[PDB]
Write a protein that binds this ligand. Sequence first.
Ligand SMILES: CC(C)(C)OC(=O)N[C@@H](Cc1ccccc1)C(=O)C[C@@H](Cc1ccccc1)C(=O)N[C@@H](CCC(N)=O)C(=O)N[C@@H](Cc1ccccc1)C(N)=O
Lengths: 99, 99
Amino acid sequence: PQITLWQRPLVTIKIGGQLKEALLDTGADDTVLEEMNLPGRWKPKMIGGIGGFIKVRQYDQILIEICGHKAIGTVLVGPTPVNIIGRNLLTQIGCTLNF
Amino acid sequence: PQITLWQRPLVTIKIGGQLKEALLDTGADDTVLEEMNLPGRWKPKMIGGIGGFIKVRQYDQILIEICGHKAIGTVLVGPTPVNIIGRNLLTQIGCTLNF
Ligand SMILES: CC(C)(C)OC(=O)N[C@@H](Cc1ccccc1)C(=O)C[C@@H](Cc1ccccc1)C(=O)N[C@@H](CCC(N)=O)C(=O)N[C@@H](Cc1ccccc1)C(N)=O
């Protein structure tokens, strides 16, 4: 699809059997989701943006679907204000910026 | 152009006659630049990211070029970690996401 930017680019993702709304975010290196359970081991991580840093849990090799496109990647979980799909996963679904 | 997301989508902008690097950021509603001097009146704004809210100065009707594309719009100035080109300007230059 071609998604315009008149409004926030929110899409439906599928992860851990749950469906969620997340923001396609080219300014995000990583994918960060609100608190949720995921399987496997994890390690702590600090991520920063406008406003400073928050502490998240890093889960590796997690299957995710973004608008029907399947991918695998690292997913961070913590107190993010909104669900963010970052560059680590945008690449996998073939997402580019065009103008 | 077409910009892939394997690295940050950093571009050259020009504002106040000077060249700066900035991030094409679909996850940002607004454009926020690092501390600098701009002409005219400003108004206050609070904007929120990953780690909380920061105070910034809003300037309207500012000339800014993004990859040589001329734009005139609102530019926020404050303690942001990096120069960010947000949707307000990405729309002016005709930027979409595609996959
Ligand atoms: C991986 C990680 C998630 C940490 O990356 C980022 O945070 N990247 C930065 C851009 C950035 C990149 C690199 C360094 C610093 C910042 C952005 O792309 C994140 C995005 C996504 C996000 C959205 C809401 C809450 C948290 C995050 C972000 O911060 N957007 C902000 C950008 C600033 C702005 N005013 O445009 C945004 O749209 N804010 C809006 C909306 C808002 C209001 C209140 C509370 C929250 C949001 C605003 N006007 O504040």
